[PDB]
Design an enzyme around this catalytic site. Sequence first.
Site, PDB file in Angstrom:
ATOM      1  N   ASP A 135       0.834  -1.217   0.000  1.00  0.00           N
ATOM      2  CA  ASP A 135       0.000   0.000   0.000  1.00  0.00           C
ATOM      3  C   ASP A 135       0.871   1.270   0.000  1.00  0.00           C
ATOM      4  O   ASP A 135       0.345   2.362   0.196  1.00  0.00           O
ATOM      5  CB  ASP A 135      -0.976  -0.010   1.224  1.00  0.00           C
ATOM      6  CG  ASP A 135      -0.273  -0.160   2.598  1.00  0.00           C
ATOM      7  OD1 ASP A 135      -0.208  -1.290   3.127  1.00  0.00           O
ATOM      8  OD2 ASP A 135       0.230   0.843   3.142  1.00  0.00           O
ATOM      9  N   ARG A 139      -0.039   8.785   1.415  1.00  0.00           N
ATOM     10  CA  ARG A 139      -0.826   8.605   2.655  1.00  0.00           C
ATOM     11  C   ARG A 139      -0.113   7.669   3.637  1.00  0.00           C
ATOM     12  O   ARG A 139      -0.232   7.799   4.855  1.00  0.00           O
ATOM     13  CB  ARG A 139      -2.228   8.072   2.304  1.00  0.00           C
ATOM     14  CG  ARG A 139      -3.217   8.034   3.477  1.00  0.00           C
ATOM     15  CD  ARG A 139      -3.294   9.334   4.300  1.00  0.00           C
ATOM     16  NE  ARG A 139      -3.465  10.536   3.468  1.00  0.00           N
ATOM     17  CZ  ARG A 139      -3.676  11.776   3.926  1.00  0.00           C
ATOM     18  NH1 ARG A 139      -3.754  12.015   5.221  1.00  0.00           N
ATOM     19  NH2 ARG A 139      -3.869  12.764   3.072  1.00  0.00           N
ATOM     20  N   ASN A 140       0.655   6.748   3.068  1.00  0.00           N
ATOM     21  CA  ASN A 140       1.371   5.715   3.813  1.00  0.00           C
ATOM     22  C   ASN A 140       2.859   6.119   3.981  1.00  0.00           C
ATOM     23  O   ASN A 140       3.759   5.264   4.086  1.00  0.00           O
ATOM     24  CB  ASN A 140       1.165   4.382   3.048  1.00  0.00           C
ATOM     25  CG  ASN A 140      -0.333   4.079   2.845  1.00  0.00           C
ATOM     26  OD1 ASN A 140      -0.931   4.480   1.845  1.00  0.00           O
ATOM     27  ND2 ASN A 140      -0.954   3.414   3.800  1.00  0.00           N
ATOM     28  N   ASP A 153       1.656   2.826   7.869  1.00  0.00           N
ATOM     29  CA  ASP A 153       0.234   2.703   7.515  1.00  0.00           C
ATOM     30  C   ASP A 153      -0.587   2.644   8.802  1.00  0.00           C
ATOM     31  O   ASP A 153      -0.266   1.894   9.742  1.00  0.00           O
ATOM     32  CB  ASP A 153      -0.043   1.424   6.663  1.00  0.00           C
ATOM     33  CG  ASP A 153      -1.551   1.110   6.506  1.00  0.00           C
ATOM     34  OD1 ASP A 153      -2.290   1.941   5.921  1.00  0.00           O
ATOM     35  OD2 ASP A 153      -2.016   0.060   7.008  1.00  0.00           O
TER      36      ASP A 153
END
Length: 287
Positions: A135, A139-140, A153
């Site tokens: 992922d 954002r991570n 995460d």
Amino acid sequence: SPNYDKWEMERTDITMKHKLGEGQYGEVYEGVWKKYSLTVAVKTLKEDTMEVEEFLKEAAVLKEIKHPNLVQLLGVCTREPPFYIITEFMTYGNLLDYLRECNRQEVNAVVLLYMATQISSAMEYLEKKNFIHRDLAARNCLVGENHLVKVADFGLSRLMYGDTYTAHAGAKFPIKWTAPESLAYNKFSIKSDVWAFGVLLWEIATYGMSPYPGIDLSQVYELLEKDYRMERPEGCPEKVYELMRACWQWNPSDRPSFAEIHQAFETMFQESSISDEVEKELGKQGV
């Protein structure tokens, strides 16, 4: 029998300021200690969680990731009132938030090679740990005041759904942001993670624009498999783009490792710009 480590922390010590967003097992929120401390992210499992405490193993993965260029587990509360996992929070927040907030005073090219070389070194280490992020995205990733970026995460399917999130396609990622190899074969390896990272370098390049926003979802598989990429962002260096192009290669054999990627950033940081190519399909900021 349950076991603990030096990471064992009493829950009474941890003070919770506000909510960062949701996670997989439950919400992740910002906090610290009494004083003499720095901002932290704490994930928890909901009151309605079962005896299936596999959350403890997720904390063990956070324990496995300990590096200065990486979000690290500060501790876990295995003993004493409900279970908490405390990890480090970097003050700027996530990379979409950081780059969008830096409409004020934009992140420089030098900071791009710095932050991205930290992520490439991070995952170079992580591959040897046999860790697949899968992922790995803006954002991570999180940024400290010193402008350093770290891998992480929260478990964030609905943290900021408006700037990006795609419909929960069964698996634990936004399918629109996900790799063509990962869509077809359903396999993730460092090779698949390098593509994810290529889109991430591009998120860094475009300064936190929405990934794959103009083009359709069913079309996203079609274009990614073909050889598609978003056009190079304006006020971004070409060198990151010629590298991310290697990450966006469909064939795993053509696509490089994070050791090769750090090498790519290494030359960039050292006084270099547009190299040889950039004949076409580079100019304006994506879509």
